[PDB]
From a paper:
Muramidases (N-acetylmuramide glycanhydrolases), also known as lysozymes, cleave the bacterial cell wall peptidoglycan component at the β-1,4-glycosidic bond between N-acetylmuramic acid (NAM) and N-acetylglucosamine (NAG) in the carbohydrate backbone. The first half of the barrel, where the active site residues are located, is a classical barrel which is consistent with the idea that the initial ancient fold was a half-barrel which became an eight stranded barrel by gene duplication, with more sequence conservation in the half that contains the catalytic residue and less sequence (and as seen here structure) conservation in the other half which is responsible for binding specific targets. It is proposed that, as previously suggested for other GH25 muramidases, that Asp95 acts as an acid donating a proton to the glycosidic oxygen of the substrate, with the N-acetyl group of the substrate rather than a second protein carboxylate acting as the enzymatic nucleophile to stabilise the oxocarbenium ion-like transition state.
The enzyme from Acremonium alcalophilum JCM 7366 (A. alcalophilum is now known as Sodiomyces alcalophilus (G. Okada) Giraldo López & Crous, but we will use the AaMur abbreviation for the muramidase in this paper) finally proved to be the muramidase of choice. For AaMur, there was a single molecule in the asymmetric unit and the whole chain was modelled, with only the terminal residues Arg1 and Asp208 being rather poorly defined. The density is typical for such a high-resolution structure showing essentially resolved carbon, oxygen and nitrogen atoms, with many of the hydrogen atoms seen in the difference density. A strong H-bond is shown between the catalytic acid Asp95 and its conserved supporting residue Glu97. The high quality of the structure at 0.78Å is evident from the weighted map and in the difference map there are positive density peaks for a good number of the hydrogen atoms. TzMur, Zopfiella sp. t180-6 and Ascobolus stictoideus had Tm above 60°C at both pH 3 and 5. The melting temperature of AaMur as a function of pH using three different buffers is shown in Table 5, establishing that it retained its stability over a range of pH. The optimum is at pH 4.0, but the activity profiles are quite broad, especially for AaMur.
Numbering used by the authors: 1 to 208
The structure:
Amino acid sequence: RIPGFDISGWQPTTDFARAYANGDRFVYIKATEGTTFKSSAFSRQYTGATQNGFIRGAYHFAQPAASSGAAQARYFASNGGGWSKDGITLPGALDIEYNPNGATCYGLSQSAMVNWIEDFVTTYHGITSRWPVIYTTTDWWTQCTGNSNRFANRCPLWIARYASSVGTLPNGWGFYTFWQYNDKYPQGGDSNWFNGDASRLRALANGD
């Protein structure tokens, strides 16, 4: 396993030299939400990661009732979720989880939610060349997608569960790619494991 972490504009402070000294090797950084929100911290964070030897990616907080999946993939890819084959850029991640402003599944049916996610990931791949990572929880995914297996053979899984073991994965995935295992990164943020060695992390960044 390889350690890493994730941050958003909630975290005032990230010393990436200190993080690299801690042994962390990758970081995900919030870029966008919906079609209107761009994190004001993203550029400082993504630059700091770059300058201090990190493999890094961006994530998008999905708002499935607000606009299409395609519109949000375009907004994300234009505002921090772009990719390049430099060995240090992770594919962008779709953070698709509990509605932070209301009912957990955003008022969508399960099949409508699957279609929304499909629209996001197909659009993101058409723009960037990469299938996005999907960040979710097994319980949200079960309730809101009907535990769909539709994305597992394209989209690496970033599963969240703050427990001593990863627990049951959503349908279709044989393994996690990333596991968010606490919300207690020492400098602020969440802690992740990558399920593989350095060669495999580089292959995920390279897309091959």
